[model samples]
Target chain A: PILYEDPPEKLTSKDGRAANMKITSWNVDGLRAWVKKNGLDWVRKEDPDILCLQETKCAEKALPADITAMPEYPHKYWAGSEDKEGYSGVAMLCKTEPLNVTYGIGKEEHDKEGRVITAEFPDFFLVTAYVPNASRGLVRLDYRKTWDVDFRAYLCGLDARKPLVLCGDLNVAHQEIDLKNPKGNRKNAGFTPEEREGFTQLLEAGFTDSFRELYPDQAYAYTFWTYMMNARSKNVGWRLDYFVLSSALLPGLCDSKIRNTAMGSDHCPITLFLAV
Target chain B: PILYEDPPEKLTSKDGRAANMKITSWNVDGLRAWVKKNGLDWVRKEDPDILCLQETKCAEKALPADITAMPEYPHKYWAGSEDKEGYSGVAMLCKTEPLNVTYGIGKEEHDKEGRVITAEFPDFFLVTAYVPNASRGLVRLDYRKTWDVDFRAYLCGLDARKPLVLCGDLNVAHQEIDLKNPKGNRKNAGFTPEEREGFTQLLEAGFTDSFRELYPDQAYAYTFWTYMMNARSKNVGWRLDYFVLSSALLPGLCDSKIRNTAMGSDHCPITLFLAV
Candidate 1:
């Protein structure tokens, strides 16, 4: 498949140094399993400046050689669960090294499972995160509420210092247009009122949903579909993976596009282009 | 493959009712995965009076139709972890329904994970167990020690009431003769000094390892082989599964055998023959 949909128009700079940085985000689900299925082939094709991944589910100490040997990206950052094996995790691979890096939200309670990582570049603070799922039957819905609160505060802190580029599987679809069969999933974990409000609050706190910002009325475009019931083939999906940015960074945003044809994971990769 | 290595000679009685009972125990790893690989075909060939399974890793509510459809054993009892999904579970399928069934050792601390199940029969109390492993680096070795004490005491209580038949993966190699390359695994979880002492205590507390009792001089006989390194093909294995009975019940014990040729799991099925 082609790398992107609806490429944005480019502008020329007076000095002839019209730089554009590409950021790609994907929830690989499990790094080892994805790598085993040759998921990295797609990565080499896209060739993004920064690659943010969620649900890597691999330990830093035991990372496969293929992940560490990605020639396109030399600066690699990993965060995996300290207590649970093969559970929630996130990672970042960048062509250019970041100024600083931080793991988790600096909260002891939610810091154990490595779900969030932030990398500071000269112009933007890039955060790759795997938000906590409320789980089936809404068993963990309350815990997810607390996470949203803490995670939003953490993002706000980064946005205050520099323009922030947040990308990952946020585990929620912000609006009914974001998912197919949203009515059926009204009481479900991802589309629940509580979780949607959490996303609404994050955007209100000075962030922009880049995909929706670019394509306000586009429907059926999605990043995640359940492996069961031929969901992906039927286009019964939810746009749970996203590239959210600080409202102040809106001017530099060239375009946000979902690379829907990628395989090997339940979620597809999304990209963000920025005018440097 | 033939079921037993060396079949014991049969005895005649004055009455034609010289009844014999067969019990089969297997650590199936995961019942769902096992059935997918047609592991149940072996059970049909063995045709035992009672079938006890460990590491079922399946919730009773979610047991596949094939497992619930075993016509040879009408009565089925399952015990699965309450907190952890698809881990440390046990089950029993018997031709005749038991008088009563009990779960765990009646200790709150150890009762959460569905590791132990006891059933009261006419002449004996049958217990199926999946003991906690010491984990790598012997991290949970101390916890295993406490479990050993409580489990032994539980067995003693059952023995006081009637002859007891205890079976499943005990997660230990009691002696150098119990495993191949014991010296190489001396400090490992299954061969640690602490685990060996726990097994010794159980035997001293009035139980007999039925396999050792029948084949006193046998070596290179094992019930489990690691899935790694082509271990089973290489005949590198450990005697981790057992049929341990109360000393009082030894007179009825005809023979104990390991069906190592069985596939679909790292551990093979072990069988015991007893005069009813």
Candidate 2:
């Protein structure tokens, strides 16, 4: 069910201190290239309390000193593939330190590509994931089916401990309105019926898609666009990246947004604001 | 021995038709990214009859329509890895069709990565190669040593049939003047004594380093610069790419050039003008 948008007056902390925190996530495609294009300028300006990145496409050792030692984000965690050189990877940078941090799901089959990072805070567990693309012609759909099942179970376990805030490129446009030209792409990797149903199952398990919850009727709101066919200029895009939270944490959700104006990546930075 | 520069009067063919042909070679690093930066503009401006590319890093099937059907140069041949995706690969585009074409060194073990392409014209056998890097910490040094021996033997065999025009990234600097930091990088993968000896053996067998032969005293005329340490901006580079020819072909060589100003890839394109 869609949650009602909370009024600004209702966004308050129990201790009378301003507890509003801004979290931003982007699939930078390649961290080195993004950094070269001054992509971090936006991060410095916005000063999000937490920044999560996906598709870093870099091994830990290859990361430049400037990135690992960024002055603003004192705490940083990276997870990358041990098997492949420059493939799927994820990173989390935060101003506040988490109590504990973990990489990947417990299963060896799922954790090989370093696609997930879970950080535990006092009140909530933040999980960032870079979901596997089913690939052209649904070549990896069978593996993706298994991944969906395992990932949902993993998040549910985290939610059981504390309300979870999950963000990153889930690699799917869940509904018809979530992407332009949805009809043409129905059988495609991201919009296949199997993939859409997988997303539906995640929501049914009691998590809220924050952007959809706040802007239920908003159209043409996209977090990711293709590099081909001048997709970004034409705004032909997909809402593949998202900020998802356990339904129990919905009461503190102040705002959710897409920074579509941001440059340097195919996917824009998505923001989630919470009163904590 | 360094060959003396030939007089211009001798560069004409016996027949009335123009004997001079311009051939250029580059290690594009990645073709997709190179095309995005309008790297082909230089190719159009230079109007080379034959253009060779190394480290294309793309499979034949994955080549974009614009690249495969490039308007100016219709005749194209691509060689890519059957065993790996987006790894070492080579391509050659020519205005005229080749009499025959072959891929690799004719050995199963060495041919796996699509590293070599040989196209036979009426007068010469043009071979482009993307030699395997020794890799960081000299991990692949043993394999590279074997490759050098085998590659030289392969080229000599082709030379026995027809004078060979060899081009592409040989991945080594033969002398101190060929690289910026020779002393500091003596033990590095590319500069290791074993690799240099391999290159020396190639020249000793029967070929001429066309560029070096043309400009014996030239310094900082590098064909490749590293992506690290502002290497390109600072002119810190290595003469890794080359236009080596059978000694018989050197008499017809008109000019050899390094297009250091070209952008898009870490490596610049090198050109050879020949009358054949």
Candidate 3:
């Protein structure tokens, strides 16, 4: 099995002793275009230890190396799709090097979309995955169903070996109140009963939704809002992103939150903190 | 015959004590839309005694009741066309009541577009007219040529009655140095030789192009720039507006200017001060 590996950093090891290594996941939608439009400025301000990005929407040549100046992370790598031009892609920026870096899970069809990037540390496996959208017409629901089952199994398999830290936009709001107008949007792609069940199965498979698990009683706390209309002002939104962790990493999970006020993309950042 | 007259506080008396009132004219392109999009904020900032607007592009019902809450200018009157929706109209905002107001040049065909709005002050007739645009293919050129003869005669008719101060987007550049690239634009509608001659005839008929007369040798001093392909950056522009006065009002012409920095409309507001 291929695993994510990173080189040792003496500076990070020293810093990791006192301050918590901040981990943040932002679904930037179009990473290359965003970088051109003040995305790097936000990165400089936030300066996360582990910055996971989703929907990069472009290939390697399109990525401007001089723009972000990602030299702070000495060990850097990208896993993008071979199928599309500018679509589903994810990236990870970390202070410490991983023991191994793995690109895709077992399913060949799901692997082609370049949705997953798993970096294995000596302690646990950190998996960052952007789940495929089920399509507005439910065109990809069948494929997405298969992906949900296989992806849950893949995460469990990794957890069986060692603890795991997983996070990304799961593309599903799991309950009636997970969205604003649940009555009208009962059949919507992200809010459909079938999609909610997929999320239920993932939690049933022994992983915990860190943010929701911490704030179980909170209502209408959503991570994403559409840019069209006055959606944000009306508070019509969906909580479709999460930071999920295995039983072993649960003791170390200090905080898991959605920073909805930040304004780089439609989906704001979901951050996580682990004990050094 | 339907005229809106109000005694505003900014009106000047015949005596030398506070005897002069400043007037401004702008082709706001779409007056109602401009109002909703913070045009009154700009009007408050500019603070002209009388603002003559051409191409209001609105119906009477579309006009807001109270645009600005400022006490400086308390009167607003508009003349709209009966023919089209949100097409060709003029408006007047004054600080004081005019002695009288006239909607058009007293012609059935000319009044159809709501092109002219004349407000009579104590000392002079302030006429605001939106000259018809010569169509791109010069389809309106013949009618425009006739308009040049008639329009000049109309101003002369007003001048025959009393001292006249006329301002608007006259839609002609009138001279070579009135534009940045006059060499390439000699055949263009605004800067064409025939159009320039028509404007020259109008000026020679006993009025002053106050701005150019003030700075005769200046070049590339443009009033209107196109929104196409960085034209403003390259300074590819045309001087198609004027603040003209009767030769008798020449000494009272303290200053004439175009406020190019204001960004709501393509053609900025042109201003003139009088000693009364």
Candidate 4:
């Protein structure tokens, strides 16, 4: 369903605007299709200070100009594949203007895929990511495993230098309790043993999983449910959405959440509130 | 302009099927947009045995089905980007049933951009490539240099194992003599000294620039004319297209020519006829 709402109506400066900024992240399968279907309208209503998008399935040129031109988030940044089109990419829309924006993680080999984006503010860096998926039937499991290790290293390297508000689709359910059909999907792409362990190693590093940290034993709180059959209705969902932060910035983490009701991609939007 | 012609009167084969095997390669700036424009009609006319496309600008699922399913070439293989949309990616279209097809050169780093494709035939390997263009501003010259060396090494590795027919947009003018304003464009992206040297290195590696071998010393013999300010009409063009072959398969090179009259891409088609 397309979202319907006007552009953020109260576009005064942050000091006069609102005390809190609402942020949402969703994998809107196709930006054009979703917008035409009603995504633009919804964005206006949500009036988010920041919106993190995944799987736009569109190149920068293909994205609607009007939607991106909103006064609320006048500046926008998108990182895309230099080799492929609309495959794995991410975009970040923010209310507060960023001091600077950086694409990729400076890894020449990894940067070509348009997977990561980092926007630097005065206080912290907002890091957005779209982790690679292990293909169905474990087809690309070996390579995916290698990516997990390398990715963790890359993220840790970033945190070593700056405090980060890292977010986006983690593409893995880190625990048996994370997904509904965990036992059946044990060998599947996202829930595989190796995949989960790879995610564990990421947490073992200094990054704190904000949502889980706040609600340590929260059950049935999921962010991703497949579109296949009745996966969403059956509550067969997985908490793959995340708002991970560096130890130095964890104190600023006020609230992290999963907007499971959002309609767009198989994955729903996730957000985190910062305590000023 | 959409070329409309009778779909071959009296169908050579029954059911309106002609088996000339029109395999084509085009760097459609954006695959999804081109499809909406004239790509479908062109696919119908070309009736290719294989259509090797560069810069599809979208991912596999983002590609429209009707055009891709052109009766001429039924199966398609894509090397998609891991990150962005409408980027530097490549795809292969096959008409005659291919035994197997692979994306990229089997390198973990290179495969992510979807640049190389290999189609396994009973007799030979048909490898299609969309070699990186030395950026217009030469901003990517260093990366291009590294890519040139590594790509040449990769192709040589392929030739070492089997008879190969390598074709696509090499994105370079091998010599000043091959372009209209050679002296003026010597420093341009496709015609720079460094870029030209890369193409020279490919020939030095024992691969035959099929078209050049047939028409050696041929002047004003161009395959790609620029679209900038009526460049094509004024005949200001560059010979950047090629069907470079492995030395072992040079004996089968029956004919090689550039379809200069063809209008569509800045690049006209380059055809190679080998002993089947």
Candidate 5:
């Protein structure tokens, strides 16, 4: 429906910025299409410190100037599938460069889709991942179970190294409260019993769902909707995108908000604000 | 510069029709985009008895009605890549139903890309293929060489069973005269000595290039031009698409022509007329 909204106003600091730290995570379906639709215009207006993108679906050769040469984001990193073209890709663009950056989650099987990127700054590490879908008929459910385990371990390892900010499309709605019509979707790929438990396991392993931490009672707030049947207009969606942080850093988590109106992709851009 | 020409007029039959059988082959690149560009309008006008397509890049779920439900072609077949979402695919549409239809060339290693489709008609077997590209830097040149060998064997097997009409983007310019700037492309993918020799070896295995058989000295007649650098406007192109047939079928080869002006993709449609 081509809808979007201004960022939620944030606390002003001694340096006189909107917030201490701001980040946006979006699954842009295909970066090429997104760019053609001027998705970057929203990025320019929102002006987050870091923008994490999932489903870029582009290789290095096809990287467009609109992305690579964005004036605000001088530091751009791309992780694209080496085995397949136009499939499962992610990117991280930073206004302020990170101290170091690495690609993948340290497991070859799960790494080939270019679904993860870890960037280390002085205070913490930021990890962006587009998790594998269980897919129709749950054909890849077994693979997804393995991925959930390994991905949690990967995050735990990073948590040990430094406080972490985990963001991007987890591809699951964790609870009934997280989505509309969850009862009907009990066996669906995202809300299946196993997928929900995986998210529960991750939350128990020392991370906090940043959005829930701030607004425990917020319902009908979602980060993803299907492209069919006016799903977005009716607010029939799931909280598949998230910014889960190490519990130790929960004190700095001031705001976690959903830009549900954003229209570049099926998944709206979600924001996380921290006082770090 | 949108341009196209009338078909090379063909010989009439005792049944008061032009040519006993007519077929066309095109590398549409992506069927969805081709349809949006009104590519089917050209197909509707030309109205070949059978049409073979390469690089359809669509799975069954995405098949558009314009292609699948065309009033003229009731029998439609699609072979899309199983492992990849949108890569190396082919299709065939026939006005008359074939006796049998099969996907792939009967080898798992060569079958993954949805590159081949064989349709058995009463008089002959029709096989359409989108040959693997050598890719820039010729990274896949070795793979292409192996594919050439296996594909030739597959064709020979089909020829043994019945006369064959083999067509599509063979992905090779067979001789110095087959493409513009052959010297500059001497080591490039399509015109490389290895690739050209692969076509020569196929013809030696009891096949004939239908276009060459009809007009041995026809030069500057190309079926493909790169999308870059105004290649089509200047007519800088390569004769990579073809209709190669069993040597025994040569008597019915009334005409073989190139629809150089077709503009839905980087490659144009090629046509063959047979008296059979």
Candidate 6:
């Protein structure tokens, strides 16, 4: 077992600026339902510099006024499925306007579900993605394989230009320690060997699994729990969500956290602190 | 202006069975979110013998354990769209099991959306329905016209068999007093002449609009408030949901109520207390 060192005491960048970039990611399942459950209030209390949401399950036109007009996070971007009314979608809200924003992975096959959105800031490119589920009985496993390769390539291309901070429900548990009941779920969608390998390839392509890199042996630190069987109450969950960042950005990484206390969705919010 | 007399103090059935039946109907928008907001607790506190829900937006398999396995209400029936996920749906929960259960209007064209469910008890037929909206721009007005005709005929057929208690979101405001801004919204889907006429025809065919029957001139007593424009706070709403019973059963209709204080959904729950 390997464990990385704890965050440094003096959280300052190379230029001696305080670590100010705080990003949080969550899979809200459905944005309207989330709002109904007072999720926006919780997000406001968290007060992240940037907030990314996956599986919003709403079209841009249909999003409620409170979400689109979030007071402090005025700079917002949303991408939703064109083919289906209420399906896979991603959204990002930021305190400051991004230099540029792009949606999806460029490949038509991979982009249809509104799974990805990238915002280019001064120091790094922040990408929020909702990876397609392999689906029950692994029906979409083959398609998921293609998505993995294409998505990794997409991230690498962005990293070539600048350090990339990717956050989302990547829909995978990369290792045994990443989930409880790993053995039982090994053949399931999130823990399947194919999905794990895809995640591994992404990490190999210059990105670091921020939380795992910082707390490699940490067990029971799961970001997602099924609604069934009191999985969350018992802490029987999976670390399927993450902040995978370009390794070059490691020096500025202040801390990575799992906010399990947050409610409103099956998946809790995960945070990444960067000095830059 | 006219107002009916208050309910009689003594609640007694004609057959002397202790005035045992109480039914409540609500358009929950989505049941999972409703439960998350502790709607079940509210329902339990209300303690209705039968609970009818509309716009459940979930498949029978996907309903949360709390709803399907509701303690006091053991018998449950749900109907949802097979063609699409998370669309229109209806459900019924009862303390005592029904003699027979049926789904939809039994019309192939209209059954797909899981909009109706009927529970046949000894004395009456209990029907829960989430009628299709005419949709914005009156796009579905033509289809809605056919639904109005067919649905009325279906209910009349059931009434001929037994006194019927049809409840749920009927998706129409029958009169100018039923909603706010009637003048401004005369052409709107729920307030359109066709929709109102459909409802008028249902009542003409022997059903009694329970709420209106008691509170005939009651203005601002509404079951549904839109999420837009702070409607609920202003009491700007529509009497779109109802317990429309066969006129013959009025003797057992002890009282009709609007649970305006309930907060889980845009539409509040309406209750019917029957001596039978």
Q: List the residue pairs that clash in candidate 5.
A: none
**Each model's number of backbone clashes?**
0, 0, 13, 17, 0, 1
lDDT of 6 by residue, A166-232 (tens): 9999999999888875634544678788999999999988889988877777777888888865667
Q: Tens digit of lDDT per residue, candidate 6, span B1-276?
A: 222223333354321223557889999999889999999989998899999999999888888998888789888888889954798899999899999999988898999899999999876899999988999999999999999999999999898877789999999999999987799988888999999999999999988998888778878788888898888888888889999988767645666888888889999998887754
Question: Counting only residues 3 or more apart in sequence or on different chains, how many pairs clash (N, Cα, C under 3 Å) in candidate 5?
Answer: 0
Q: Evaluate every candidate with DockQ and list the scores.
A: 0.00, 0.01, 0.01, 0.01, 0.00, 0.01
User: What DockQ number belongs to candidate 1?
Assistant: 0.00
Query: Which portions of model 6 miss their true places by more than 4 Å?
Result: A1-17, B1-276
The DockQ value obtained for model 4 is 0.01
Q: What is the C-alpha lDDT of each candidate?
A: 0.85, 0.85, 0.75, 0.71, 0.86, 0.85
DockQ for model 2? Answer: 0.01
User: Candidate 1 lDDT, tens digit per residue, B231-259?
Assistant: 67877788999999998777787778888
Candidate 3 residue-wise lDDT, B1-276, digit = tens: 111111123232211123255778888878766676676777778688998888888877766665533467676667788855676788887899889988878777677788888888766788888887776877777777877888888889988777788898888888777777778877667766777888899889988898787768767777677878766666667887788887656644556777776656667677776665
Clashing pairs in 2: none
B124: Cα error in model 5, Å: 0.2
Candidate 2, B1-276: lDDT as tens digits = 121222232233221223368899999999888988888888888789999999998888888776888877878999998854788999999899999999999898899899999999876899999999999999999999999989999999988877889999999999998998899999998899999999999999989898788779988778888899888888888999999988766545667788887888999998888766
Candidate 2 lDDT over A1-276, as tens digits, reads 121222343234333435488889999989999988888888998789999999999998998787898989999999998686768899999999999999999989989898999999998999999999998557799999999999999999988879999999999999988987564455456888889999999999999998888778887888877786577787878899999989877778877778888899999888787878
> How far out, in Å, is residue A8 in model 2?
12
CA displacement after TM-score superposition, residue A232 of candidate 4 (Å): 0.9
Task: Compute the lDDT of residue A202 as modeled in candidate 3.
Answer: 84
Error of 1 at A119 (Å): 47
Model number with the top lDDT: 5
Specify the CAPRI tier of model 6: incorrect
Cα displacement (angstroms), candidate 3, residue A37, comes to 3.1
lDDT of 4 at A243: 85
Error of 1 at A4 (Å): 44
